Every structure is written in C-alpha cells, then in structure tokens.
Amino acid sequence: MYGNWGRFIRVNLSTGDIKVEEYDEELAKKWLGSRGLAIYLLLKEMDPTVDPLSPENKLIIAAGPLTGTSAPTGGRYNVVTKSPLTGFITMANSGGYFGAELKFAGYDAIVVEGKAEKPVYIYIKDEHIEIRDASHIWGKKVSETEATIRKEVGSEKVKIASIGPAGENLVKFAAIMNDGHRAAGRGGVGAVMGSKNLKAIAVEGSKTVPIADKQKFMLVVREKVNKLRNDPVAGGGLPKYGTAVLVNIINENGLYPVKNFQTGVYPYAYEQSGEAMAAKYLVRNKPCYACPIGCGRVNRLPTVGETEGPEYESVWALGANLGINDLASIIEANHMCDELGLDTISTGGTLATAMELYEKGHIKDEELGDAPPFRWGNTEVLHYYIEKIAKREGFGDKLAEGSYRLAESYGHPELSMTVKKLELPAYDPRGAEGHGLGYATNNRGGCHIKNYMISPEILGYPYKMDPHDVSDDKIKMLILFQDLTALIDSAGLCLFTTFGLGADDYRDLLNAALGWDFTTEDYLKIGERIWNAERLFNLKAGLDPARDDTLPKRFLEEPMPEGPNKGHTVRLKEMLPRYYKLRGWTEDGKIPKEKLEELGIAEFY
C-alpha cells in the first residue's frame, strides 16, 4: 500500500490507552483517505446521536494518501467530528506542515476518544506515542502553546495542532489551529477537542511516504506543477495578492455582503482588498507544505508585529460584513482569532447578528453597560469583544453561542444569516443562485468551500456559467463540485489546484502514487460515496430536509437592493427538488436503500 500507511493511532483519553490499528488497501479503494476514511470510522463506531460535547463523541484528525508527498499542495489534512454548533457532521480542512509531519511519523490518522481528567497533550515521534500533562499550558494562546511545547520536547521540528482559550472554554465556534495561523476552522472542532481536555498534539516524523511508482510519479508531478504555474490565478493572482484578490472582484459583481447581508456593494472595498494589502502591509507570501502557489500572506503591523493572513473570508467577516473599512483593524482582529482559536467567519457572523439586533433595538445599551455599542462601522467592537468571546467574559458569554442561538434568545432568529446554524460566508446567494443551492445542501451547514460554485458562476472555472441560471445543468455542476471536492479533500491536496487541474489530473497523480488503475469515473464515485455517507450520518443525527435544507428568508424574500444584481432573489424552491432527484434521493431528501446498495454502503442503512 503506497501513499496511505494503512495505520492510525487510537487514543482513549478516559482510560489513557493507545493502540495502533491497521486497515487494508481494499478499504482505501473504497474511501481513499482523510475525509473519506473519517466518515467511515464514525459511521461504523459512533452513535450519530451522541452529544457533541460528551466524551462519547470522537475527534478524527486525518491526513490523505498524497499528504506528505511531492504532489503539488500535498500537505493538507482534515478534522472530522459531530459539530457542537450545528449538530451535524463537520469536516475542517487545514494546511501548513502539520499534516505532512504526521505522515512522516508513519500514521494516516489519530482517533481521539473519551476525556482526560486533567489537561494533556499527545506527543508523537515516529513510533513513540505519549500522553503528557498540559496543566501548565492550558490557558495559553496558540503561539505560547507552541513555544512551550517546542522548548519542552526540545525540538523546533515538531509540528503542533492546538486549541486556544476559546476551545478550552467550549466556544461553539472554536477552531483547531496548527503552524500558528493555519485553521481547521469551522463547525466548532475546537470545542470538541477542548471538551476532551486535549490542549494539543505535537508530531515529529522521519519516514518517507511510500509511492508506488516514483519515476512515473515525479513525471506526473512536474506536468501538474507546470499547469498550475501557467494558470493566471494559481500562477499570478494568488501568489501575488493571496485569496484577498477576490475583494474587488466580488464587490464589482455586486455580491460582497455588507452589514449582515443587507446589501452587496461596499464603497470602501478597495481599502481592504488584496491589492491594497500588498501595497500597505505585506512582507512576503508563504507556501504550505509542497506548494508551488504560495498564496499565504505574511503581514507586518506596527501594533501586533509580524502575523499571517488574513484570508479573503476573514477580511470580509471582520470588515464589510460589519461595515468596517480599516484593513489594519481587520488584520489585528484576524491575528487575535488565530491566537485565541476562533473561526473568523463565525466570529464576524456572530458580531454582525449582534449589530443588526442592536440596530433593530433588541439589544439595549443598558445591557452592554460600558462595553462598545454594537454600532455598524465601530472598530472598537473588534478590539474589545474578540477576547471577551474567547473567555466567555461578560457579553462574550452570549456571543460564544453563535449567531443563531444569540438571535433566537432575543426572539428574532430571522436576523441570523445561518444555514443549519452555521454562519454564512462572503458571498450573497442573490448574485450566484447555484452557490445558494450549495449553502442549502452542504453537509456541514452554510458553507462555501465544500462546493465552491463561485468558480463556475463568477470566475469562469471550469468555465463561465450564468449566475442566474437555475437549470439541471447548473444543479449538475453543483453535484460535480460536491463530489470532486470530496475527492480532493480525501486525497490530501489543496482545493486551489482546481485553478489549472481537472478531474483527470487528480486521477493521474493518485494512480501513479497508489499504483491503481482507476478511471476518473472511479475516483469521482468515491467522492459521491463520501457525500452520501455524510448525508446518511446527518439523517441519522436527526436532519429534517424540509426544515434544514433552506436559506434565511432574507435571500428568498428580499430583492437585492442595489448593484448589478438588484432585484434578484434566490429561486431555491425550484432547484431543491430537482437536486434531490438528480442525487438519486427521494423527493423528501432522503437516501433510499437502493442507492446505499449501489454505493456499497447498505451496511449503514
């Protein structure tokens, strides 16, 4: 078996016992790895109805077959668990170097169970797996945590994945950070880790991931790297301005959400664009393991010093979303989210809900006391609240619950722009209707990257589609993106490789490395199998398609007020049933046993 090691660590924190389990190539041929392997283990061992914050829930950190190889961007891994925020499955992808290091230690994944009695951290150095006391690290920011551990194990090569005070305090949108600023960010994966009293995981490896045909593999690798290098996005836009290049693009297209999705055009968007960032604060770009793109940003601020990020989504969530223009305040806010272990999107989305509730008079000043008023454009909200949230201090305790619960507690859940309680990202669905269907059907909630329909609808990859086309062809593109993305996630590659590479390219790399002879059609079915397995878990976890697969009324009832998309609304009712049909599911959005048997997963009926 190549690429994959066929080994994974299983740690039971309650009992303290560790065991290295193995699996066979036939399992890999079914679920590929990372995201796919994770959903299988969950489906086979965990009751989908467990309380996400109880010791029965499992946290799976998993690398993919191409993670740690020379495959361009082969350094990604996924964290999978039941979300304490949405109540459904969640896969959070992260880059950096941690993923590659796990593979170098000789493991594919780590299955964490139970709950330790006192804070601890797992130290791994090749075959040496150890559970150490973290009572002295608990309470520290990510940067401090990494520093302490590196000094303790006396090694700077050790890669670390940790939670900040937010995770420790069970903030519903706590993230798991690694390599300082890389995030397995959404779904509350950090709260799950914190509930187990697991402060961090430190790895050191020295092995070389086995590849089926090195000569052939290196041949393929150079061809793909060349394609990415010749692409204007992967070869010009991203390395030069990072993901933040999108600001001006999405704004010019009139779907850049401003003030909790009230409108889609922001007059000061340029001030927080990738181009403006590059001219004002950028030091250089930074690549994740084995990346020929280098979209990561390294900024320097006279206040917080050198820092990494923010990504587009973070610039938006903490900027225009809140009616804030100040890029410097946005960079500071991003840095604090990284240090504290908070998802930038949910944080900003939660702060936007409070601002709208405040605007509508549901949150009164007498309730805030002397804390900054939740007034649009108020930058003090960013400097003050982010820390209060991490520690559940003051109003920070209410905010730590997330947008939905916060709005619901004031009797106005309609002001919460969430889908399955996950806060929506930087693109208004009224200007890209296929992307809207994505938000409604995404297995993890109102999320954009597990089905990035902005590529076809706005960017022109694979090719340009009308953002207002709601035909079967548009629905089919969605299904394709969902399955393909499931493949890419499982492979261990970065989604951005789609700016140059296509399904066949991924087949070439996977075959050369694994030594398989699958057609592109075979790999895509693994993706469809993964998408369906996640849906089933959710369905078993209690998902009601009618109530849960929707979009906030704002998008279905209020015409876009201005910009090139003025007058538009998302035609979800029309698309939804056709989507279920084309997915092979029933009218009511459920998976019939016939489909399960077809995908070879009827054992989970």
338 is in an annotated binding site: yes
Alpha helices in 360-456 (DSSP H): 365-368, 380-390, 396-399, 403-408, 433-441, 454
- CA–CA distances in Å: residue 33 to residues 8, 545, 555: 11, 28, 36
What distance in Å separates the CA atoms of residue 175 and residue 333, rounded to the nearest whole number? 15
Q: Which residues pair with 298 in a beta bridge?
A: 284, 308
Cα angle vertex 174, ends 168, 176, to 5°?
Answer: 90
What distance in Å separates the CA atoms of residue 243 and residue 317, rounded to the nearest whole number? 14
Strands 296-301 and 418-419 turn out to be unpaired
126 is in an annotated binding site: no
What distance in Å separates the CA atoms of residue 101 and residue 157, rounded to the nearest whole number? 9
What residue ranges bind Fe ion (CB under 5 A)?
A: 329, 332
Cβ-based nearer residue to ligand SF4, 80 or 100 = 100
Q: According to CB under 8 A, which one of 20, 218, 279, 582 is a site residue for a second copy?
A: 279
Full DSSP string of 117-146: SS-EEEEEETTEEEEEE-TTTTT--HHHHH
Residues 325-344 that bind a second copy (CB under 8 A): 325-329, 332, 335-336
Kindly state the smallest distance separating residue 245's Cβ from a second copy, in Å. 14
- Cβ contacts of 116 within 8 Å, gap of 6 or more: 13, 14, 16, 131, 196, 197, 198
What distance in Å separates the CA atoms of residue 93 and residue 95, rounded to the nearest whole number? 7
Q: According to CB under 5 A, which one of 181, 392, 421, 474 is a site residue for Na ion?
A: 181
Q: According to CB under 6 A, which one of 105, 293, 324, 543 is a site residue for ligand SF4?
A: 293
287's contact among Na ion, ligand SF4, a second copy, none, with CB below 5 to 8 A by partner kind, is: ligand SF4
Q: How many CB atoms lie within 10 A of CB 477?
A: 23
Kindly state the smallest distance separating residue 324's Cβ from a second copy, in Å. 9
Q: Alpha-carbon Rg of the chain, whole angstroms?
A: 22
Q: Is 288 among the residues that bind ligand SF4 (CB under 6 A)? A: yes
296's contact among ligand SF4, a second copy, Na ion, none, with CB below 5 to 8 A by partner kind, is: ligand SF4
Tokens of 557: 């009832």
Could you tell me how many residues of this chain bind ligand SF4 (CB under 6 A)?
Answer: 12
Q: Is 335 among the residues that bind Na ion (CB under 5 A)? A: no
Cβ-based nearer residue to Fe ion, 135 or 303 = 303
Residues 365-404 that bind a second copy (CB under 8 A): 369-373, 378-380, 383-384, 386-387
Q: Is 446 among the residues that bind Na ion (CB under 5 A)? A: no
Kindly state the smallest distance separating residue 10's Cβ from Fe ion, in Å. 44
Q: Is 309 among the residues that bind Na ion (CB under 5 A)? A: yes
Kindly state the smallest distance separating residue 288's Cβ from ligand SF4, in Å. 3
222's contact among Na ion, Fe ion, a second copy, none, with CB below 5 to 8 A by partner kind, is: none
What distance in Å separates the CA atoms of residue 310 and residue 188, rounded to the nearest whole number? 20
Kindly state the smallest distance separating residue 381's Cβ from ligand SF4, in Å. 28
Instruction: Name the site residues for ligand SF4 (rule: CB under 6 A).
Output: 73, 95, 238, 287-288, 291, 293-296, 494, 496
Instruction: Name the site residues for a second copy (rule: CB under 8 A).
Output: 271, 275-276, 279-280, 301-304, 325-329, 332, 335-336, 369-373, 378-380, 383-384, 386-387
Going by the annotation, the residues of the binding site for tungstopterin are: 76, 93, 95, 182-183, 185-186, 338, 342-343, 444, 450, 489, 493, 495
